[PDB]
Amino acid sequence: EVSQDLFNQFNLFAQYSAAAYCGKNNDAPAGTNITCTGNACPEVEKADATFLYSFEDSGVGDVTGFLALDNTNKLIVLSFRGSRSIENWIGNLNFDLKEINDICSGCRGHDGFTSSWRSVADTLRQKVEDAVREHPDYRVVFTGHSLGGALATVAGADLRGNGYDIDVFSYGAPRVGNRAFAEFLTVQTGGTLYRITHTNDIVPRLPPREFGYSHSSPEYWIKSGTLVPVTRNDIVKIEGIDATGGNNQPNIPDIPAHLWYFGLIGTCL
Amino acid sequence: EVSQDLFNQFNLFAQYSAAAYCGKNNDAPAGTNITCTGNACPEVEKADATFLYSFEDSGVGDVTGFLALDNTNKLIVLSFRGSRSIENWIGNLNFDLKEINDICSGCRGHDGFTSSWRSVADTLRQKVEDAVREHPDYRVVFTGHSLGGALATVAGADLRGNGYDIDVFSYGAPRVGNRAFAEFLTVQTGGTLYRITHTNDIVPRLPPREFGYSHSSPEYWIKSGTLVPVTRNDIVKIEGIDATGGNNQPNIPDIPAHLWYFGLIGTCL
Ligand SMILES: *[C@@H]1O[C@H](CO)[C@@H](O)[C@H](O)[C@H]1NC(C)=O
Ligand SMILES: *[C@@H]1O[C@H](CO)[C@@H](O)[C@H](O)[C@H]1NC(C)=O
Ligand SMILES: [Mg+2]
Ligand SMILES: [Mg+2]
């Protein structure tokens, strides 16, 4: 029974996430208005929102995304793009873990996702801190769909505790590491993670539990269909690390369900 | 206005049109159930609907689509697919008109669309007539999106007046010929043409009028945006050969608006 207010924020960061794929320019000047093709982010376009910094193929893991200033919603938004070819990304996904003791003790995380974040963290923390110091009453939100949602979760876990709260809104994010990391992500203070999933989306089911992966609690499960508008009654809050009955159900998953989080996402008309 | 009953046919033939692209099965042997990926054609899935015949790269013009038997709605549906690559197809669209005296006197048609149809006409007329002879109380409906909307319109014009009505439902169809042809399609007896357009979709604006092309009347104009659900009152019936104030407006057109007719069409999640 999610609040009307939190539902409206789920929609907004779904569109910031979507905007990471469908942004008008990929070399866009800082200060230029955020717009999308194909009506992928109308709520963002309604806002007084601008690009503070745009990154494409950035650092080791070819990280793509933007830092946005929203003067209407009073947000600093760091949005990470998922893969440009999601089916190929899924098939090629490695299940290798790595120590991430610098984020939390005994925590391990997907090699790729944690590597990629580490390679751009210094730059993006600096950009985020300039924004905080220029706009101290502005709320920091990190967001991402798919791979982008993994990056956003890792970055949030990493940069929390340094003076600014960081909310994270992840959309069809894969598992990011082991049970220790899931437990950290579940109780870490200095912001809330809203880990959002849809029906039988394949990506939150990877990498598999059998390779040493766990999901953080809680889960915000969208049970309304692919290409169906989402009502507030359509979101189910599921508590427990590796809880089942949401997206973690013993049935055949689906790629199309990955591309529909409140609206079209991870692809551009 | 349009009745709720007509709004439901528009939504059903939009999904029969969508299925020409997202047809879950290309194996697709006669008698197999119609299903789509990505929730593209749920109303078709609900119906007892089967492939009577399926064609790919058919004839000179490489016509693709299927002939369906629907025992729930009692339909014989010929569904033509538009292009695999609509943006490429829009850019390479040649405006050459061909004499089509054979279908109506003084009529000229798009050389491509009319040549394409003529090359599969004998084979496909025999398949509909076979289907009509076994199910004479069934309604014959030709439908398609984009290039598919044009093929259906030409097929309709050509095969009508042979003992069965042919209703045509086109989605974002281009202009198919000159004013003589547009007039023939406005008054032809032996079924109705439902020519449906969306906001500022580019495709119903091609080929241009200044290449001697005209639209048949009427036009059913969807005013609701891209990725927005369509309500009955969002559809405006616009009367008049080459009427303006629907899709035929002197503003900047849009490709994404081509891919949203009631839902996702001409593309498959
Ligand atoms: C950018 O957005 C601002 C605030 O939303 C608006 O007032 C201005 O007209 C926009 N600039 C451009 C280039 O459209
Ligand atoms: C096809 O649909 C029919 C009628 O709705 C049904 O009897 C049958 O179970 C379906 N076939 C398959 C392969 O699902
Ligand atoms: Mg704006
Ligand atoms: Mg016409």
Closest CA of chain A from B39, distance in Å: 6
Q: Please give the span between the terminal C-alpha atoms of chain A, in angstroms, as a whole number.
A: 32
B136 token code pair: 């004479």
Backbone angles phi, psi at A169, to 5 degrees: -120, 110
Which DSSP state fits B252?
-
CA-nearest residue, atom 9 of ligand 1: A33
| Contact status, residue A50 vs residue A69, Cβ threshold 8 Å | yes
A69, B3, B174, B259 from B195: Cα distances, Å = 44, 16, 10, 16
For residue B71, give the ligand nearest its CA.
2
Whether residues B256 and A264 touch (CB distance < 8 A) is answered with no
H or E element at residue B199? none
Tell me the DSSP string of chain A.
---HHHHHHHHHHHHHHHHHHHBS-SS--TTPBP-BSTTS-HHHHHS-EEEEEEEEEETTTTEEEEEEEETTTTEEEEEE---SSHHHHHHT----EEE-TTTSTT-EEEHHHHHHHHTTHHHHHHHHHHHHHH-TTSEEEEEEETHHHHHHHHHHHHHTTSSS-EEEEEESPPP-B-HHHHHHHHH-SSS-EEEEEETTBSGGG-S-GGGT-B--S-EEEE-SPTT-PPPGGGEEEE-STT--SSS--SS--BSGGGGEESEE-SS--
Which DSSP state fits B227?
T
Q: How far apart are CA A147 and CA A89, in angstroms?
A: 9
A48 CB near ligand 1 (under 6 Å): yes
Q: Given ligand 2 and candidates B27, B32, B45, B48, which is best to mutate, with the most ligand atoms within 8 Å of its CB?
A: B48
Q: How far apart are CA B159 and CA B164, in angstroms?
A: 9
Question: What is the radius of gyration, based on Cα positions, of chain B?
Answer: 17
H or E element at residue B21? helix B4-22
Whether residues A227 and B37 touch (CB distance < 8 A) is answered with no
Helix (H/G/I), strand (E/B), else coil: B196: strand
B163 Cα distance to chain centroid: 22
Q: Say which amino acid occupies A27.
A: D
Q: Please report how many Cα atoms fall inside a 13 Å half-sphere around the Cα of residue B248, on the Cβ side.
A: 24
Whether residues B38 and A225 touch (CB distance < 8 A) is answered with no
| Contact status, residue B257 vs residue B247, Cβ threshold 8 Å | no
Write the CB contacts of A137 (distance below 8 Å, at least 6 apart in sequence). Answer: A74
Write the CB contacts of A93 (distance below 8 Å, at least 6 apart in sequence). Answer: A112, A174, A206, A207
Rounded to 10°, the helix A147-159/A179-187 angle is 70
Tell me the DSSP string of B40-69.
S-HHHHHS-EEEEEEEEEETTTTEEEEEEE
| Contact status, residue A170 vs residue A153, Cβ threshold 8 Å | yes
For residue A47, give the ligand nearest its CA.
3
| B75-80 and B63-70 beta bridge pairing | antiparallel
Q: Say which amino acid occupies A150.
A: A
Which DSSP state fits B80?
E
Which residues pair with residue A140 across a beta bridge?
A: A76, A166
| Contact status, residue B81 vs residue B64, Cβ threshold 8 Å | yes
Q: Please report how many Cα atoms fall inside a 13 Å half-sphere around the Cα of residue A144, on the Cβ side.
A: 28
Resolution (A): 2.0
Task: State in Å: Cα A32 to ligand 1 middle.
Answer: 8
| Contact status, residue A45 vs residue A36, Cβ threshold 8 Å | yes
A141 token code pair: 């939100």
Whether residues A269 and B263 touch (CB distance < 8 A) is answered with no
Which DSSP state fits B209?
G
- Active-site annotation holds for A258: yes
The closest of A173, A136, A161 to A248, measured between CA atoms, is A173
CA-nearest residue, atom 1 of ligand 1: A33
- Which of A37, A40, A226 comes nearest B269 by C-beta? A226
Q: Say which amino acid occupies B25.
A: N
Which DSSP state fits B123?
H
Whether residues A38 and B226 touch (CB distance < 8 A) is answered with yes
| Contact status, residue A46 vs residue A170, Cβ threshold 8 Å | no
Q: Please report how many Cα atoms fall inside a 13 Å half-sphere around the Cα of residue A131, on the Cβ side.
A: 28
Which DSSP state fits B173?
P
B140 Cα distance to chain centroid: 13
Helix (H/G/I), strand (E/B), else coil: B203: helix
Reported residue count of chain A is: 269
Q: How far apart are CA B14 and CA B22, in angstroms?
A: 12
| Contact status, residue B72 vs residue B135, Cβ threshold 8 Å | no
| Contact status, residue A151 vs residue A117, Cβ threshold 8 Å | yes
Q: How far apart are CA A2 and CA A237, in angstroms?
A: 8
Name the experimental technique: X-ray
Residue B31 gets the label, from left (phi > 0), alpha (psi -120 to 50) or beta, of left
Helix (H/G/I), strand (E/B), else coil: B188: coil
- Which of B40, B225, B269 comes nearest A259 by C-beta? B269
B205 token code pair: 């604006």
Residue A24 neighbours by CB distance under 10 Å = 12
Which residues pair with residue B66 across a beta bridge?
A: B54, B79
The closest of A94, A124, A122, A121 to A109, measured between CA atoms, is A94
Reported residue count of chain B is: 269
Q: How far apart are CA B89 and CA A113, in angstroms?
A: 39
The closest of B155, B139, B123 to B55, measured between CA atoms, is B123
Helix (H/G/I), strand (E/B), else coil: B97: strand
A261 token code pair: 């989080």
Which DSSP state fits B219?
E
Backbone angles phi, psi at A119, to 5 degrees: -70, -10
B46 CB near ligand 2 (under 6 Å): no
Which residues pair with residue A237 across a beta bridge?
A: A220
The burial of A40, by beta-carbon neighbours within 10 Å (0-12 exposed, 13-18 middle, 19 or more buried), is given as buried
Q: How far apart are CA A209 and CA A226, in angstroms?
A: 25
Q: How far apart are CA A210 and CA A207, in angstroms?
A: 8
CA-nearest residue, atom 11 of ligand 1: A33
- Indicate if the alpha-carbon torsion angle A170, A171, A175, A176 is positive or negative: negative
Helix (H/G/I), strand (E/B), else coil: B239: coil
Q: How far apart are CA B210 and CA B269, in angstroms?
A: 36
Sheet with A139-145, side-by-side order of all strands: A49-58, A63-70, A75-80, A139-145, A166-171, A193-198, A219-222, A235-238
Buried b (16+ CB within 10 A) or exposed e, A102-138: ebbeebbbbebbbbbbbebbeebeebbbebeeebeeb
Q: How far apart are CA A148 and CA A159, in angstroms?
A: 16
Chain A CB contacts of B229 below 8 Å: 229
- Active-site annotation holds for A146: yes
